[PDB]
């Protein structure tokens, strides 16, 4: 055989990229916090008004609030070229909060998609008490499920010349864990909720079309807008992650430029993914006239 040596020189604009990401992340932090906080407040006040206010909406806002709230720790670590200045216990705690809440928010979207179709067909002769009970049961189940999937990553997350905190997975399964976990994150994050989103919005569009009274008040386009926005937020990031996995397994031949491209791509798409939590309030709450009226009341 022969050994080819590829000297990989330091990339020029790495510092610039990290500064740019911090610059985007601050905007994510501000907009996400503000949006979610006002939604939670308005949600509480709407129950007072006598509205059948969805439990799911309140929960979605809370879940997004937490994800957005774990941003500063990531920013601090990122500026120092992913070096870790905090403690191991800090690393574990921040990661667990980030993970549980992120999965939970996505799951609440999925619940709402199903709930639209159920509200038109099934729930219309169902007691008010019974539907509220169903929402509460689902709310507990989503939090529990979110907690369950988040836990393994935090367990193996341990702070490791230069200090970094990066998860060290079991000796004989390092590979397995890494790859496995991310794919679960991809499917549960995007494939499963996108499928649900598409199906129950296609059905919703069909149902509204069959109706004549409904379609006057409900736009046809906005239904598909929900589907397309979800697609846009998640697909690039998961593609970037998959490309990274391919490069590691070298089905993409190594180039210093390829590494630079991956580094840039992962970071940019990470910003796009984190924009998801900001955009969640707009789709389900802001469109509705009722929310706007309540929000005006709350504001004054």
């Amino acid at each position, epitope marked *: 055989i022969v050994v080819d040596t590829v000297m990989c020189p330091n990339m020029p604009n790495k510092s610039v990229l990290l500064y740019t990401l911090s610059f985007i992340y601050i905007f994510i932090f501000v907009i996400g916090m503000i949006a979610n906080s006002v939604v939670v407040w308005v949600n509480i006040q*709407a129950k007072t*008004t*006598g*509205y*059948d*206010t*969805h439990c*799911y*909406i309140l929960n979605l806002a809370i879940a997004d609030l937490w994800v957005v709230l774990t941003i500063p720790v990531w920013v601090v670590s990122l500026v120092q070229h992913n070096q870790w200045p905090m403690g191991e216990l800090t690393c574990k705690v921040t990661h667990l909060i980030f993970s549980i809440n992120l999965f939970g928010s996505i799951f609440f979207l999925t619940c*709402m998609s199903v*709930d*639209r179709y159920l*509200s*038109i*067909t*099934y729930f*219309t*002769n*169902t*007691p*008010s*008490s019974r539907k509220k009970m169903v929402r509460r049961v689902v709310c507990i189940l989503v939090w529990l499920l979110a907690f369950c999937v988040s836990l393994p990553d935090t367990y193996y997350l341990k702070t490791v010349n230069e200090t970094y905190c990066r998860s060290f997975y079991p000796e004989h399964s390092i590979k397995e864990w890494l790859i496995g976990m991310e794919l679960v994150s991809v499917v549960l994050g995007f494939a499963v909720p996108f499928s649900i989103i598409a199906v129950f919005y296609f059905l*919703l569009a069909r*149902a*509204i079309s*069959a*109706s*004549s*009274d*409904q379609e006057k*008040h*409900s736009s046809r386009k906005i239904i598909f807008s929900y589907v397309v926005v979800f697609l846009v937020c998640w697909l690039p990031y998961h593609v970037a992650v998959l490309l990274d996995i391919f490069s590691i397994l070298h089905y993409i031949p190594f180039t210093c430029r390829l590494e630079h491209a991956l580094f840039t791509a992962l970071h940019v798409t990470q910003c796009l993914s984190l924009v998801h939590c900001c955009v969640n309030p707009v789709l*389900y*709450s802001f469109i*509705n*006239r*009722n*929310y706007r009226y*309540e929000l005006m009341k709350a504001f004054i």
Partner: antibody
Amino acid sequence: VQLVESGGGLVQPGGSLRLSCAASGFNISSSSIHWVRQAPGKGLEWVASISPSYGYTSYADSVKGRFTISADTSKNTAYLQMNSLRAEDTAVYYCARVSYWDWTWGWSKYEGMDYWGQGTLVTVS
Amino acid sequence: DIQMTQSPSSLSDRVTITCRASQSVSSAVAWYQQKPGKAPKLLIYSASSLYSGVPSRFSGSRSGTDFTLTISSLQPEDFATYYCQQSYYYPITFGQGTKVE
């Protein structure tokens, strides 16, 4: 959206009788149809309801089991079918609609019965 | 049934109809107006939100289990047996009727 009742008449106790609430307009499987009886010189009392999507009926205790409610979605109409007639049953039977629109959903409210018929008089002589 | 005590059952103008509930029912009450030999017309669904084509004189409120329909100035279309309803729990339970003479 118009409701017209066809039925009523004089029918001896222990009998049966059917009423129809013909609906012209709205999809009747995206709304629940309820019946409310006003007994002569006495208060209202809920009678029956149906969500035709899954045929999810629901009846008041007084008429529980002994009345039946069945709907057709092909032509919008709901049918209240009575059995075991009594003086209790003597009333003017109105058909009412609880309506729904999916434009709002997440910031919904607890709607009442809004589109009401004109009612047929059932007498149990 | 989840009982409701609607009072007074006779009335005559500042008309208030107070409806108490046996259990906490949360804004699923309804009020009505059935003119004699004519089907009811909705006046207030939820607990304070009027239905379309229902005048501004009608005003709902919830004070726990003490719901109330208010008519600040009475009109000759208001002589009807108003029936308190709750739909929070099924069976849907109607009041005792509030005749307005």
